[PDB]
Amino acid sequence: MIQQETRLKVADNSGAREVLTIKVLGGSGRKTANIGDVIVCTVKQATPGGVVKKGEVVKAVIVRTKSGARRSDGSYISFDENACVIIRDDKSPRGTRIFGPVARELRENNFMKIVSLAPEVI
Amino acid sequence: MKRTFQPNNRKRSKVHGFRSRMSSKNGRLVLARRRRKGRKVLSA
Amino acid sequence: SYRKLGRTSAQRKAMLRDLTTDLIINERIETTETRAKELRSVVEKMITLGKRGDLHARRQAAAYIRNEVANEENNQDALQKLFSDIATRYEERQGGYTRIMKLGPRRGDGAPMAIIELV
Amino acid sequence: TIQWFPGHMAKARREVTEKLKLIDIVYELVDARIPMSSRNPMIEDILKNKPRIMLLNKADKADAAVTQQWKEHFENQGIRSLSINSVNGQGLNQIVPASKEILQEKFDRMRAKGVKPRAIRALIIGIPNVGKSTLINRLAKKNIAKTGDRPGITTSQQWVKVGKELELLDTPGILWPKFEDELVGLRLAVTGAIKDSIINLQDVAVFGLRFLEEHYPERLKERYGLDEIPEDIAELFDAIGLINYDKTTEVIIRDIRTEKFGRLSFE
Amino acid sequence: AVPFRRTSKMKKRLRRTHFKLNVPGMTECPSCGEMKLSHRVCKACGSYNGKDIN
RNA sequence: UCUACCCAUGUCCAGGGUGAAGUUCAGGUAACACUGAAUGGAGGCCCGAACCCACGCACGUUGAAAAGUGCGGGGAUGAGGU
RNA sequence: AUGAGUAGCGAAAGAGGGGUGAGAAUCCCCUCCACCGAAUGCCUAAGGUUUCCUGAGGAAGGCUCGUCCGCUCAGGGUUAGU
RNA sequence: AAGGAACUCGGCAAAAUGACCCCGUAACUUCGGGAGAAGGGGUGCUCUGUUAGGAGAGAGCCGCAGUGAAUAGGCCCAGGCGACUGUUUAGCAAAAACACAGGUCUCUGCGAAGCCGUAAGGCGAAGUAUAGGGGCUGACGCCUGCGCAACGAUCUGGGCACUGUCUCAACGAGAGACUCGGUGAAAUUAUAGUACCUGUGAAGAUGCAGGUUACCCGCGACAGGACGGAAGACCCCGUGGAGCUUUACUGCAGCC
RNA sequence: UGGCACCCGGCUCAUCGCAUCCUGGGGCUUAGUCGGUCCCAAGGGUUGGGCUGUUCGCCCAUUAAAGCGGUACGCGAGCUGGGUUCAGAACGUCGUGAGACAGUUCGGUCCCUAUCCGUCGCGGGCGCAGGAAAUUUGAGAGGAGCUGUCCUUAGUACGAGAGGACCGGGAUGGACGCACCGCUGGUGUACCAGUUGUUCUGCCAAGGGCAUCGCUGGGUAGCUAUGUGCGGACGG
RNA sequence: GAUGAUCAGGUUGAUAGGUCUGAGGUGGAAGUGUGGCGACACAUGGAGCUGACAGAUACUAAUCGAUCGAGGACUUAAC
Ligand SMILES: Nc1nc2c(ncn2[C@@H]2O[C@H](COP(=O)(O)OP(=O)(O)NP(=O)(O)O)[C@@H](O)[C@H]2O)c(=O)[nH]1
Questions:
Q1: Partners and quaternary state (chain C)?
Q2: Are strands A57-64 and A83-87 parallel, antiparallel or unpaired?
Q3: N or C, which end of chain E is more exposed by having fewer CB within 10 Å?
């Protein structure tokens, strides 16, 4: 359950290592987000030189959460950290690599490229 | 908190006693007035 | 749910331990009705423990029975009486062993009193 | 980016406009290290039909040659300019005669009109964290204004009667509501004049390092006990030490404003 | 809050309408006891409809 | 006999830290002042109980109390408390 | 008189069995349990002036009850050359 | 649970560190400090083992957790103000206000100068210009304004730790509330058989006019009205007082 | 010894008007995509933050939209000095002395057991032409009423082209509401284990008391949301 | 469920407690053997313990009795 002022950690090789959310898109008074949603965030930790810079405002997709997703058949999934991938408005990976496991829910949200680049999908 | 009255027998007799009243003139006037009224107890 | 008897848990356990060993010695006592209804659940459990009889059961009841003289001449305490000549009395009777017997209220505070005794 | 613009700044403009008539002469304080970017067009639009002089305070921390060149550029532009050091009176003696020469026309007109000459009324205006109160205290020798080493000390305009000769008006610093050119904002943030808790210090440090590498490579070489000019910033940061990964940025900006380096200017 | 006005006798008497007691439960004398209470002992000898106790 | 200041006589302060002057050996010297080592126990010095205050919050405000209680806080060998 | 049989009954662990008695949750005895213990221990100041001990009592006072009391009646009790 | 200041004037409140040893410690400085700076590591039990003389080292054995419960410092940056320790409005203000060590000006030759008293008689002092009264400032280093080293329940701003402050509340314990037995007050009170809506009215209607609703009596809760209750929580006026200042007068003090 | 006009912000709860911000229905002026303007309509909805004294205020990011107003600031016997607003202090400006201005700043005490009318719940009487037990009709009243994307229609209407409707179908969200504990979690003080100090049952082993339930790891029933099911669809 | 009230029962009966089987929770009981110098490990044994949840079983309590509660008004039309 990600919300305002929640610090995630990027899982791609763009140069940003930690972001802080600003708003959750997709509703008049929406206040929570889960796996497979899109958020707007500000970069809080980045290398002095690189593609992205500190203080920049971007948007990302959540891929891991402490509380996972209740699947249809009654199975549950859960991770140990909250991670996001920075994207463009056309839903493509801004970086080149995806690190760590990636939830399968992304596949049903037409995030095909991220799923393809992921090493292991659970 | 300390209340204003802390009893003590010596100081009472030294200040409001009979001999203290009789020492000066105003004390004698006080004794005369109390005798005139007829109070059972006078001085202290 | 269990009654609270208007006391903290530690004091409630203390009262229960006191009363359940006062009853075994005297075999009939007089208390308040709402306090004797909450007592019938423990005495019968202790009586079942006494009816079992093995060593493991005896050490279980030793944690819920206070040290009192009970009988004087032969010097047997509450636990020995419970395991000796009470389990022998209720040998074929399965189920309730106690009887609750109501009576009037008392002058001081109008609480309804009752007498509880072994059957 | 940089947006700092509280409400007292907004009230200052209205107060200045409402008390414009009494003003005789205006002093516009401008930092010497960044003479062009330190000007405020917003307050200049309000200020017209009034003679004025450009003042360059904190002139000890800037290079003499570039400041003198800028002084020439202001002079031949069509405005009088001067270089001043507030903390120790360097050019403070040569401002009263300049004011007298400027206002002599109205002074003689009034004198021939049949009244005794009166005191000169001056208004001091400029961006925050420049010597607009230290200068007044030096001029009055009294230490009557409150000064501090951070922007936003004074909050209300005040009249100061220096003898029977001057009536000075002080004013809290004013910034334009919205910046346009990011380089000007970066320079202003480097020099101070901003609360520094609203901006990104890392970008300021990066700008400082790249400007240094471009302009004063020798001063960057000497630095503080290390001699290298690599491509990134992490080489210099971890000189003297988990250590602060990038909090050393503050250190980079800490010394420069205190002139641990030699005198320099950004122009 | 303090009362705005005193209350008349009629209002007080009407308020005390439901403030009364109840006639107790009356049963037979147990073992020639004295008119004992329902589900309780005889006053004479603690009898239960003739079943004396205590 | 409460509180302000003064006078003459008594009395109280669990424990633990830091280590000034002075002294001795001594690189240094021709010996210093300065190195270190040992000894030494100064201070309106430090942490903190009894004792004395009264900075924050909450309760109480026809109160247990006509200035209190609970949890934190300041001084605690001195221009001290009694 | 109304408010009204309303607010309150002033920090805290007691349970059972015997006894007295016209009347017992509250008085006496016994056994367990529980709290303080740098005192909620003992001894002796200022101060109080019969409150101390024994036998009787149930009007009034004990924020309830009372066969009990620092309450009401009768008696008794305080010994210094250190 | 998830998040971790998003609340709010403000991290107010609560949460978090805390004990014994062993390593390691910055800028600055009045060279004494800062400093327990900041940061790391180890604690249980058994044998070796009169352990050398009470170790230390070694080997081992358990739990999620070893100062296993109670009591023991939260830390780091930047600006003002005051040098410091201390003192103040008992009962609204503990501070930047008072005092303070140092500096400076002025009077005083001894029956001193100043004070208390009508006077006698005293303090100053049994002391004598390196000593006493009365003013102004207020450490010590740099100028005739500039330095914050050390201290602070001081005023402003920032960053870590950490959390029910909150997104958004949910359970649980105790003392009240509620029922029964005993005892049992107070502020207030013109008499009342005491609805609502649009009007009227000294101008803000349970009581007046027109209409609409409403069987009699209680118990547990809320606080819109009775311009609710108790000490007016403030604008005039007292040809009402007291206090205060004199180029308003007139008296008695002292001094010449 | 001039001239001539006027007579407090925040919290918790809401309710009403239309002079309509969005959604519905229309003329229009406007290829469509759109946009502008003017009528009819009050049913529902109408946001989170950073600097800031929220001002004669700046910015960030969303949403179909971030409407204007009345009700003794709507609302203190419901809550907050947080502005206003006192006795202690610094600087100031004016003044011939008793003082004048607040121009800036730091600190700084009010309470209330609900009598009546009102609202929200729960009972006791009697009435209703014979006494009772069930099941009911419905004069009346209250509740609900919101919207976005995506696929088809088919790039078909159009538009030389680029570019593009659309309300008939079909899916699926946001916010709000009503239920419930089968699942994921929370609490769960008479449930089960580990462990520190001290004291007690004559001692060893077994146990009891006290230390916030002594402290830690779990946790059944019940109560619960952050969990699960359903709703606002039309139609006359 | 604040108290009244409502609902399930009153000995042709499963309303409550107890007892016996279960379901969940915890996680390998006491005693006795074996191995080790000892702290400890293994076996007997998914062991022992179990508030509120289920199914059986009258073992203990729901005995007595008391109180209340109708005989259907009048007129006119259709019998
Ligand atoms: N070196 C140097 N420092 C100067 C000079 N003038 C001013 N300063 C520094 O600037 C600070 C004071 O600046 P100040 O005049 O108060 O700035 P401001 O514009 O008045 N700020 P505000 O208006 O908000 O009160 C001090 O740190 C002072 O040392 C100068 O000429 N040289």
A1: Part of the 50S ribosomal subunit. Contacts protein L32.
A2: antiparallel
A3: N
| Token representation of residue D66 | 């570039």
DSSP one-letter string for D90-119: SSGGGSHHHHHHHHHHHHHHHHHHT----P
Distance separating alpha carbons of residues C113 and C29, to the nearest angstrom: 11
As for how many domains chain E has, the answer is 1
CA distance D220 to D227: 8
DSSP C32-100: EHHHHHTTHHHHHHHHHHHHH-SHHHHHHHTTS------BTTTTB-HHHHHHHTTTTTSSS--S--EEE
Tell me which of D43, D124, D133, D135 to substitute to probe ligand 1's pocket, judged by most ligand atoms within 8 Å of the beta carbon: D133
| Topology given in CATH for the domain delimited by D179-261 | Conserved Hypothetical Protein Ylqf; Chain: A; domain 2 (1.10.1580)
- Answer yes or no: are the C-beta atoms of A19 and A10 closer than 8 Å: yes
Answer yes or no: CATH 3.40.50.300 is held by domain D11-178: yes
Contacts of C104 in chain E (CB under 8 A): 37, 40-41
| Cα D163 to Cα D147: distance, rounded to the nearest angstrom | 22
- Cβ(A105)–Cβ(A69) below 8 Å: yes
At E45, is the secondary structure helix, strand, or coil? coil
Which tokens sit at D18?
């409402």
Give me the CA D191–C1' H158 separation in Å, rounded: 19
How is residue C79 written in tokens?
Answer: 């636990």
Q: Which CATH class is domain B1-44?
A: mainly alpha
Query: Resolution of the deposited coordinates, in angstroms?
Result: 3.1
Which domain covers residue A100, as residue numbers?
Answer: 1-122
Structural domain containing residue C119: 1-119
Domain boundaries, chain D: 11-178, 179-261
Please give the method by which this entry was determined: cryo-EM
Please answer whether residues D137 and D147 qualify as being in contact, where contact means their C-beta atoms are separated by less than 8 angstroms. Answer: yes
Protein-proximal positions, strand H, CB < 7 A: 1-6, 39-40, 77-80, 145-146, 157-159, 167-168, 173-175, 180-181, 187-194, 217-219, 226, 228-229
- Structure-token pair, residue E34: 């004295």
Q: Which residue range(s) make up the domain with E40?
A: 2-54
